[PDB]
Amino acid sequence: DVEFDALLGSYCNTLSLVRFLELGLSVACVCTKFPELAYMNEGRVQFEV
Amino acid sequence: DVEFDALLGSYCNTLSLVRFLELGLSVACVCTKFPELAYMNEGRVQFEV
Incomplete structure (x- = not known):
């Protein structure tokens, strides 16, 4: 066996x-790579409307 | 007559x-044929996921 x-x-x-x-x-x-993003403090966008 | x-x-x-x-x-x-299954004792298949 x-x-x-x-x-x-x-x-x-x-x-x-x-x-x-x-x-x-x-x-x-x-989506845009901003590869220095840690070094940024404050950002703004302008709007002329 | x-x-x-x-x-x-x-x-x-x-x-x-x-x-x-x-x-x-x-x-x-x-459907798979296998002439030795009486000589087989246990059968195991392990899976990967």
């Missing part, structure tokens, strides 16, 4: 990653 | 035999 325990497979998933600009939400944001 | 009897027919039952690959059931399982 012979006996064996069989390991018959496994399946990983691809952890898919989205872009955030490959997405319809990103019309509402104007 | 003449007198007899007439066996006026006898008809058989045609048996249809299924094949199980020509079904919508086959989409649900993975």
Whole structure:
């Protein structure tokens, strides 16, 4: 009498990653990198209306 | 006078035999053959997510 325990497979998933600009939400944001942002103190925007 | 009897027919039952690959059931399982499963003791599959 012979006996064996069989390991018959496994399946990983691809952890898919989205872009955030490959997405319809990103019309509402104007995302611009300001890479000195820590060194900023206070900023204003002008509006002549 | 003449007198007899007439066996006026006898008809058989045609048996249809299924094949199980020509079904919508086959989409649900993975038919794999493995001649040593009586020699198998336990079977394990581990998964990754």
